Design brief:
heterotetramer; A: mainly beta; four-stranded antiparallel sheet; three-stranded antiparallel sheet; B: 4 helices; 76% helix; flat; binds 1,1'-dimethyl-4,4'-bipyridin-1-ium; transport protein/immune system; small multidrug resistance transporter; transport protein
């Protein structure tokens, strides 16, 4: 159910500004954890967390041309499966 | 006066526990903040109302109207000895209230 | 043991309330920090027993003993104020509590 | 037999002061000390900021050099003791 609609608004060779639909007031979670790592897997992934009222987040420090996989987890799996997508800088 | 804040702390705790049953594991941000605000207020209310009235009385009174009001608004929209027993403690408050 | 890990939760709250009179409106450090800690302990143990103990049983047990426990701690830690006549009101408040949970 | 005690200026700086105070005994420790600073001449209001009661030190910034100021460390209420106030010229 939440989060819903994970897409990339702006894109730099080294950065990605992502956004999602945080739900709607009474379905606002307290936080979303965002996981971004290389689409391959030669190294582990990176991960941070964003407050639940926020629907957007920035991802800095990426390598140009490399494809990445971004996942936005809810606080728990009860709010639905985590939405994940793919993008190339 | 002192039994106004005690009952105000009763309403606060009741609203907190109900906003807790609405929210999940403190994840639903809006009612999660409600529970924190309701609690932080109610604890600051009990801290101030315990200096006035005897504490074992503010204790007893709270456990009374607590389940009394929690089951009062239970039949409100959500989910016999409970109606008369309500008036029983309610009269018990009437012989420890001003 | 569920009923005994409840007893830790009820006594932690019983201890914490008498410290809240020392908290001085949450303006005195050590009693102010003391009552939030004692209540955190009560939280930890009640939820530990709610997976085994039914609701109103644990609550009315808390009620009667809690009215009893701190009122004797108040008759010793501090003393007595009393602004009305009947002590038995709290026992029949507890009784009114006992007959809307158990009954 | 009051708190806080011994309000002193540890370090100084044209635009910042570092102060401390004797918090007293453990039963004399409070939850939040509020601290007020302003000009000695008194042609302005009084800036105010709080600090948790488990810290006996506080740092102030944004001062104008050369001016004489008056610092006063308060308490949550007026029951713990009279507030200690001192002076210092940056
Ligand atoms: C953490 N905490 C919650 C509620 C109370 C409380 C005390 C006495 N009564 C009767 C009800 C609620 C005390 C502490």
């Amino acid at each position: 159910s939440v989060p819903t609609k994970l897409e990339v608004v702006a894109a730099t060779p080294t950065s990605l500004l992502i956004s999602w639909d945080a739900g709607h007031w009474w379905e606002w979670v307290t936080y979303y954890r965002i996981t971004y790592g290389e689409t391959g897997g030669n190294s582990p992934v990176q991960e941070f967390t964003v407050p639940g009222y926020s629907s957007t987040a920035t991802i800095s420090g990426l390598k140009p041309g490399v494809d990445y996989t971004i996942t936005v987890y809810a606080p728990t799996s009860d709010y639905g499966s985590p939405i994940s997508i793919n993008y190339r800088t | 006066n002192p039994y106004i804040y005690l009952g105000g702390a009763i309403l606060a705790e009741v609203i907190g526990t109900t906003l807790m049953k609405f929210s999940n594991g403190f994840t639903r941000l809006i009612p999660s903040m409600g529970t924190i605000i309701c609690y932080c207020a109610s604890f600051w209310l009990l801290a101030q109302t315990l200096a006035y009235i005897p504490t074992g009385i503010a204790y007893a009174i709270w456990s009374g109207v607590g389940i009394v009001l929690i089951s009062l608004l239970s039949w409100g929209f959500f989910g016999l000895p409970a109606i008369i027993g309500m008036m029983l403690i309610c009269a018990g408050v009437l012989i420890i209230n001003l």
